[model samples]
Target: KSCCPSTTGRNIYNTCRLTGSSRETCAKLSGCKIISASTCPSNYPK
Candidate 1:
């Protein structure tokens, strides 16, 4: 899952992932000074 830091005064967090897909997108937008990204998970064992 991706990790996006905030950039504005408002703190926001979101995550997006599709079934059968290995790509994930996580983001946070605001008026702060934070911005970053990360890799998605490989798999989930139940």
Candidate 2:
């Protein structure tokens, strides 16, 4: 899993199982602005 930013400055969530795209895949998706994995939210499922 990876954390992406939303327009409101909140993190958007994504998963390959849910969106058919992992971090690498999300890199090319529009609006899929990825932050460092280190910065992922504490709530992010490990």
Candidate 3:
């Protein structure tokens, strides 16, 4: 099973790349901070 944070990271890294997507917006959508659009959160659980 996946945790909430990990789910968020995968979504941001793989599924959240869209037209006009920005660091802030992408992070906002995924409930994470804006490090990079493709960066999965390091602390996410497996």
Candidate 4:
């Protein structure tokens, strides 16, 4: 899951599996800019 600009502030999307990563793992990392989960806050799967 990568966090990108979603008009307002930011949003998270489940696309880490393409890069050999899982939505759960991507959502728990902050250093992984490639998969920023803060874009959607607590709602990781979403």
Query: Which numbered prediction scores highest in TM-score against the true structure?
Result: 3
lDDT of each: 0.26, 0.45, 0.51, 0.41
Summarize candidate 2's per-residue lDDT along 1-46 as a digit string, tens digits.
3444453222333434267666556544534445565656544322
Q: In order, what is each prediction's RMSD in angstroms?
A: 11.3, 6.3, 6.2, 8.1
Best by lDDT: 3
Q: Which is better, 3 or 4, measured by TM-score?
A: 3
Q: Which ten residues in a row have the lowest lDDT in candidate 3?
A: 33-42
Give TM per candidate: 0.16, 0.28, 0.43, 0.26
Ranking by lDDT: 3, 2, 4, 1
* Alpha-carbon runs more than 4 Å astray in model 4: 1-18, 31-46
Q: TM-score winner between 1 and 3, please give it.
A: 3
Tens digit per residue, CA lDDT, model 1, 1-46: 2333322212233222222333322222321222243442222100
Q: Which of candidates 2 and 4 reaches a greater TM-score?
A: 2
- Model 4 per-residue lDDT tens digits across residues 1-46: 3543432222333344456776556544422334433554443223
lDDT for model 4: 0.41
5, model 3: CA deviation in Å? Answer: 2.0
Candidate 2, which segments miss by more than 4 Å at Cα? 1-3, 7-20, 33-37, 40-46
